[PDB]
Amino acid sequence: MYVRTNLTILSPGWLASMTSADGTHAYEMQKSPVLLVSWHGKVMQLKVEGL
Amino acid sequence: MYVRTNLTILSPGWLASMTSADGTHAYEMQKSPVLLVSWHGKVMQLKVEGL
Amino acid sequence: MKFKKPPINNPSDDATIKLAEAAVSVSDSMLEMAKVEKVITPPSKDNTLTIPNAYNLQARASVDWSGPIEELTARIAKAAHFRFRVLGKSPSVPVLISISTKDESLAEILRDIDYQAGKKASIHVYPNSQVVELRYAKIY
Amino acid sequence: KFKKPPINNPSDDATIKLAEAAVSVSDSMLEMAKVEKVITPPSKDNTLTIPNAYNLQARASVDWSGPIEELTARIAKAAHFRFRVLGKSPSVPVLISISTKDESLAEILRDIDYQAGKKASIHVYPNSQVVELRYAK
Amino acid sequence: GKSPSVPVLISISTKDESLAEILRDIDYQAGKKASIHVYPNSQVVELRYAKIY
Amino acid sequence: KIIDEQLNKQARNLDAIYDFNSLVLEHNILPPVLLEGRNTLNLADAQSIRISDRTYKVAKQAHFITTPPTWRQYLW
Amino acid sequence: VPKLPCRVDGACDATIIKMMTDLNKKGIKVASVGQNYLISIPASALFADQSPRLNWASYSLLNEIAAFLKQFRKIAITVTSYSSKYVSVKRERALTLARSRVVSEYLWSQGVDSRIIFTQGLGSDKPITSYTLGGDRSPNARVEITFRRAV
Amino acid sequence: VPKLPCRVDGACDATIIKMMTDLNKKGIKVASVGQNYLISIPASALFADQSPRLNWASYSLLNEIAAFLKQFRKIAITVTSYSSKYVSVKRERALTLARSRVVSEYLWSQGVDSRIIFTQGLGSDKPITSYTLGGDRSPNARVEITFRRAV
Amino acid sequence: CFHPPYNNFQPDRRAVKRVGVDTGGGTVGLVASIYRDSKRKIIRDLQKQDIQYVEYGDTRTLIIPTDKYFMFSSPRLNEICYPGLNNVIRLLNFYPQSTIYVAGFTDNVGSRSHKRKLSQAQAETMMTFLWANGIAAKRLKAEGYGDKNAISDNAIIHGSAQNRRIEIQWFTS
Amino acid sequence: IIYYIQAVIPGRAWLIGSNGSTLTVREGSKIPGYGMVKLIDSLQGRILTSSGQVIKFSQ
Amino acid sequence: LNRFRYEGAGVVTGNNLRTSYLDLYLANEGTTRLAGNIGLQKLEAVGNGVTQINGVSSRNLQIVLKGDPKVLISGFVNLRQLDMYGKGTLSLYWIKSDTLTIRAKKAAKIQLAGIVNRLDVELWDFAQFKGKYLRAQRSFVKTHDKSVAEISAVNHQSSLATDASDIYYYNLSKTRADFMAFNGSVLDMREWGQSDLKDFDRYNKQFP
């Protein structure tokens, strides 16, 4: 799974990580039906579908 | 059989004994349907289910 | 003559009980580890030398944050009316900070942040020019 | 006439014991960090201070990632100061990467020397408007 | 001493005798594995395992 | 479902007590895991017993990681 | 549809605007400019004469304010306390700061889903009106809360 | 589940409460704190005037209190005696010790499942009240039992 | 009438209010007042609340739950249960010469020094509260122990919950 | 040997020694191990020493 | 010489006097200067006059004023109890005592400094007590209407105010208890300027 966002992924780890000059974060990692991030000091969960 | 407890085992003996620093005992022993233990100077029988 | 005992509360939960049973042992182990570490290594000084409190640092705060650092300290500086500077560079691995308290002032809050950062980063203050300087750990 | 109790309060024995354990472990971790963390003396920190010169108070934006020699030469030219270096140029030159929008060349040079650290440092003379880049050995 | 992996077991069934006699009986039944000592002026009761093997 | 929602309700203290990043080594490497036992005795057969005071074992060798784990991959 | 909620939980804009109207009717100052909301409360209706204490009935107003703040989604809250000039500057600043601490503590005890709360007291270091005949009765002495509605 | 008894046999909380209430109605002091339980009886229902002998009629109350005691589960039970100041220290100590010894022996003979029974008598060394007008009628003289509930 | 914040630390004019609302008869008002202010009625009210009272000879004790009457991990005191404290003051009005001891007990988990500090804080808060309630300081002394003389097991959750406690002892002469 | 301040007044201070030595110290006075007294503060329990160290309240 | 009672409205001045104990009864605004080393356990003055005494060292002393004198005393005193009913002003230098009980009725301006192991203060009205620089391990304060108390508690502080009673504490005690009935007030009123100030901890966050 390849994911592009501007959040900060915490839960599942990853292998490939890169960031643009504008803080956009791109990751490549193993498939997982979920993610967990922190927004502004609040932990939130993201549901991944389509698997 | 492997048993994890904190009491003292009497009847069928055992082959491997171990104790944690906390005060928890673990035993590897032969199979049995019953066990005899000492609780506070009082005898006690324990029935084994699902052999 | 009705007979009872003082503590009567709402019913508990068995899973919570088991969680507490684990947690008490974990906490005791951590306490013993901290004690032995303090014994073996004697501390020398304190960060308050490099982070001395001053006026207008007594405006009080209460936070609950368990995320990154940069925006948190930037908001703190903006509230304090202090010029923010960053030295070093943010590494690829993010530096995460978990903080939860109530009614702690700026000086001790910043000291706690610095201690929790530990080896990854450091904080310094300059009341002469109202400067908050955050320095990363440049190694390798 | 109505002071409601706190909504998220540990109104159970298990909850209150858990919260007490959390306080204890937080305190223990704080002690651990306190003893283990090393500090540095502000009387001995090796960070070049602000040259406090008027021409060093300008504002600019700069993005760079590469060798420092030409960068500091350009900065000195912008500040209208003579610039020179001493030492032997390392085979693999020192590299930095600064991206910034609105601050002053004083802080720029400060961070430059900080990132340089052991390999090289910089010195500023405002009496004779010069900047020196000193290498290591 | 150190508690041996094999525990020390006893069987006590008596009636209305002194603490000193109880302790002496305990020491007798323990025998070679452990011993009991008393320091009255310090009000101390001590047991010692047997250093053996 | 009941236990999961109860755990979710009682959230903050769980991470507060089970954080790992405070224990993670400087080099972004998870330190290994050790197992300790004391007062071990075994018998193989007649005329064959072995006694040891303490034993220490290494479960998982240390390795790098990008993010500290959490209670997520252990409780829910 | 039932799986993913249509709105943030506990959202009723009709109730929100109705309660804002009720507060302004009762005289609590409510104002919105852009994504930033501000609410001012005269100190006379809450505290006694130059006192760090509250009457019992003030808890009703406190509960109303907490219920309002529950609805919105925010990160940072700033509370400040202004007062008149009585004896000195330090005493007034201390009184304002203590009052701010008390109100902030009760708010945090209540279910305000915030991230950061700042408390400041300024005493009479910046007046709001040229009329200063009254003491604590004067409208200048008050408390103020500011925040930004973030997304 | 059917093999496992639903409860420890011969146990009924209602019966426990009823008998404890009846005992305190009779006038024997009963106190409960946590798992620690204490009971106290004046010597007027057990012995003659400073006598190490047991009145025959007292056996009914002895049986009742033993029946109540056996209901719970224990490890060790302590019985202590307190007396007035009559002749010396030695005489009082010996009398208290004899009383405690006899009552402990009878209790142990009765069907009580206590692993350990401790007995002692301090005579007139730790008075419970300053009112010492009466002799054996004084509430200060007494025999008491204490125990810790076993889970 | 009355004020929830302990009526601003003044004696209550309660019997006059009761007889007035009764007349709104004298005899029934008086019997209502005696029924209300009867010492045994007060003790029954304390039993109705989560407070225990123990009498034995001439020394008497009172048992208070730390969690129910305190903010968690806070030397502050919850104001919700103020009727219990009012009853405490009214009852202690009946012993105007007894000396006072107050002590606190906590659980078995955490830093022992921290436990001692918390117990001291709770005990001092209670003693100062009574001092404000109007008894001269020379008659009182506070003490917060650690976890020495437990009344229940600490390895059991409910046992520890019962264990954490506040005790008040007073003699007669 | 270490000294401490106990009672502080404008102009006059009360000094205790590690051995229990008492002292009623004015601004002009030589104090052993610390040299000469110059200035005292009522607001802050800090007294500068001619030798160059600072003496505060005990803990 | 053990006793001196002065009536006659005169001027008295003396220095370099030595004694064990003496008792003084001053009257009629006798302007009195004393510059000797004197111990004493009793002292009384009518009022409306000034009095200076340099050097006092006694094991005990008890004083209760009646009029409105202007007294200043230097030395070391172990005091027990003080009462005030007029418009008095008093000041000391050092006190090595453990138990003090102070009652104030009408007006007293008291400047005290020293060591106290236990202090009780009662203020009725128009009593301004500046016990700054007077460190006390145990402090109890009771203030009625129109009272001002500057306190220097150390470890354990108890304070109750009825209404319009101000109590400012210039030190953070390890245990604080403050209560206001109608319009009481208790404030830290500290400097905020020192570089080594300490903030609240678990055993301090008591809120007014």
Residue numbers in the entry:
A (entry chain EH), B (entry chain DH): 311 to 361
C (entry chain DD): 23 to 162
D (entry chain Dd): 24 to 160
E (entry chain CD): 110 to 162
F (entry chain LC): 76 to 151
G (entry chain DK), H (entry chain CK): 38 to 188
I (entry chain DL): 42 to 65, 88 to 236
J (entry chain Df): 208 to 266
From the paper:
Using 3D variability analysis, we reconstructed a total of five maps that displayed differences in the way the outer membrane cap (OMC) and periplasmic ring (PR) were positioned. These maps led to the identification of an approximate 16-fold symmetry about the center of the dome positioned within the OMC. Within this dome there are 16 α-helices that appear nearly identical at this resolution. Indeed, a model of the C-terminal domain of DotG generated in Swiss Model using VirB10 as a template fits into the resolved dome density. However, we have unexpectedly uncovered that the Dot/Icm incorporates only 16 copies of DotG into the OMC dome out of the 18 DotG copies in the PR, giving rise to another symmetry mismatch within this system. Based on the structure of DotG modeled within the PR (residues 791–824) and the homology model fit into the dome density (consisting approximately of residues 857–1046), we hypothesize that DotG extends from the PR to the dome, though a physical connection between the two structures is not observed. (A) Two DotC were observed in the maps that were reconstructed during 3D variability analysis, one which contains an N-terminal extension (DotCLong) and one which does not (DotCshort). In contrast, the N-terminal extension of DotC was modeled as two relatively large helices positioned near DotG and bridging adjacent asymmetric units. Notably, this portion of DotC was only observed in either four or five of the 13 copies of DotC observed in each map. The movie shows that the OMC dome, OMC disk, and PR of Dot/Icm T4SS can accommodate various orientations in relation to each other that suggest that the complex could undergo a ratcheting motion, in which the dome and PR rotate back and forth about the central axis with the different regions of the complex tethered together by the physical connections across the symmetry mismatches.
